[PDB]
Design a protein around this ligand. Structure first.
Ligand SMILES: CCCCCCCCCCCCCCCCCC(=O)OC[C@H](CO[C@@H]1O[C@H](CO)[C@H](O)[C@H](O)[C@H]1O)OC(=O)CCCCCCCCCCCCCCCCC
Ligand SMILES: CC(C)CCC[C@@H](C)[C@H]1CC[C@H]2[C@@H]3CC=C4C[C@@H](OC(=O)CCC(=O)O)CC[C@]4(C)[C@H]3CC[C@]12C
Lengths: 42, 390
């Protein structure tokens, strides 16, 4: 069988979200050093 | 204000007993140490290139002359010639270090903030000092000047109730702590106690003492010192051996630390200056102007150390440049003459700092000798034991 996903709404968002996340690694933990440079007396 | 208003005759005999050139007048509460900055002319905050380049290149030339003289006769020199070269190089470096301490407070060349921060870092490196920790500690000093339990980045005096507490906590004066305190505050090694201050920087090498948005700046601040003691200190040893290290590095280091320690110790310690805890009678302008001392130098030493003894002209005006620190003092005595305090270079003053003014008592609000204080609190232990036999 099949659950006929296109006439749903939770399946729509969960589907698009999982596809987007699986496309490519888009986590960036190394862009937060800018947060450790906000008070500089230079 | 401890020995405040009474006839000037006894304050003058006190000034002669202590080697002081003056004792202050009465200061009333409710003032701001920034007030009297309104008096100085609008040209005392001026910028000029020649004075600054002289202030940086004169002690440089002193140090260079000393090194050249030494490397001319690297290790065949006798002991007192070595001492002369060490003293000369240490004095030149104290001058360069005052230039550093100027650019740390951003008042040396505000035109180029980056160049001046780099200069301060470079000149602080050879002494193993981090620029931002120094700046934080100095502002924290200015804010709590002469406050009890609060200014630990100055010459915080040792009080009486705490020493009795430690007396009981060690079970007598025979533990390591009491002996250490005695030996450090009784012999001329006190004149080098600034070394301990250098070990209280590097706050455990711990970023948990600071504000997160500053981490990347604090670490770089700990980098220039470390890198130095990681790159240059080996090279020297490699090319000079142990002795060749005790000569070209360690002795000018002890000289600079002597100069630093004595400058601070004589600038903010005196028997006519009380140390109040705030709430129990503290005030900003009072503990700033009334609880201070200014020292006199020979003009050669004053052009070498770069006005290293004028600490009040830049405590009333935190943005006052360095080549104007004497001139500004010229104005201040014109206005607050009776309240100022002054002193001169004298081994008698240092000897009284070493032997007489050792322990601060808050009852008489003044400094006392350590052996008398220690015998008398032993006598108070006898008293409380007499109250305890039953
Ligand atoms: C040069 C150009 C200078 C221009 C800049 C002038 C700035 C002047 C301000 C500088 C501030 C320096 C403060 C000095 C300071 O607080 O030191 C004074 C401080 C003492 O000061 C107080 O001392 C108390 C008791 O420890 C607490 O530590 C307080 O926190 C501390 O503030 O020095 C000490 O920490 C000495 C105790 C450590 C024991 C000494 C061991 C010595 C080792 C032997 C030495 C080798 C043998 C010789
Ligand atoms: C060996 C010389 C010739 C080169 C320069 C060495 C310095 C960079 C070293 C030597 C002494 C070190 C200090 C010795 C003791 C301490 C305490 C230590 O921290 C703690 O003990 C944490 C607090 C605690 O335990 O209560 C580490 C930092 C610090 C300041 C050290 C920082 C690095 C210092 C200044």
């Amino acid at each position: 069988c099949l659950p006929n996903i296109h006439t749903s709404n939770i399946l729509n968002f969960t589907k698009n979200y999982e596809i987007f996340k699986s496309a490519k690694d888009t986590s960036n933990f190394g862009k937060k050093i800018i947060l450790n440079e906000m008070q500089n007396l230079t | 204000t401890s020995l405040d208003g009474l006839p000037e005759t006894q304050k003058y005999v006190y000034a002669d007993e202590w080697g002081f050139s003056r004792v202050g007048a009465d200061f009333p509460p409710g003032s701001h140490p920034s007030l009297f900055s309104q008096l100085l002319p609008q040209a005392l905050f001026a910028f000029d290139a020649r004075a600054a380049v002289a202030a940086v290149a004169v002690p440089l030339a002193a140090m260079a002359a000393g090194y050249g003289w030494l490397w001319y006769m690297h290790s065949i020199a006798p002991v007192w010639q070595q001492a002369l070269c060490a003293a000369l190089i240490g004095t030149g470096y104290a001058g360069l270090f005052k230039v550093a301490h100027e650019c740390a407070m951003m008042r040396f060349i505000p035109q180029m903030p980056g160049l001046q921060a780099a200069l301060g870092t470079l000149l602080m490196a050879p002494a193993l000092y981090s620029l931002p920790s120094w700046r934080l500690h100095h502002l924290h000093h200015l804010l709590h000047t002469n406050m009890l339990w609060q200014d630990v980045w100055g010459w915080h005096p040792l009080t009486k109730v705490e020493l009795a507490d430690e007396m009981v906590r060690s079970g007598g004066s025979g533990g390591a702590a009491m002996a250490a305190a005695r030996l450090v505050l009784t012999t001329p090694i006190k004149l080098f106690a600034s070394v301990g201050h250098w070990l209280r920087s590097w706050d455990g090498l711990d970023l948990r003492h600071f504000h997160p948005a500053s981490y990347v700046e604090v670490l770089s601040g700990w980098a220039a010192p470390l890198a130095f003691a990681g790159l240059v200190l080996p090279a020297v040893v490699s090319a000079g051996g142990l002795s060749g290290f005790v000569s070209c590095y360690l002795a000018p280091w002890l000289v600079f630390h002597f100069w630093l320690s004595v400058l601070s110790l004589t600038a903010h310690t005196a028997p006519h200056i009380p140390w109040r805890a705030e709430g129990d009678g503290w005030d900003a302008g009072r503990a700033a102007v009334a609880g201070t001392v200014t020292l006199r130098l020979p003009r050669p030493l004053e052009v070498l150390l770069n006005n290293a003894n004028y600490m009040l002209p830049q405590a009333v005006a935190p943005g006052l440049p360095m080549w104007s620190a004497p001139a500004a003092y010229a104005v201040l005595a014109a206005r607050l003459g009776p309240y100022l305090t002054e002193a001169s270079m004298s081994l008698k003053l240092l000897t009284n700092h070493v032997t007489r003014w050792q322990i601060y008592d808050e009852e008489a609000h003044t400094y006392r000798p350590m052996e008398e204080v220690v015998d008398e609190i032993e006598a108070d232990l006898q008293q409380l034991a007499a109250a305890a036999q039953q």
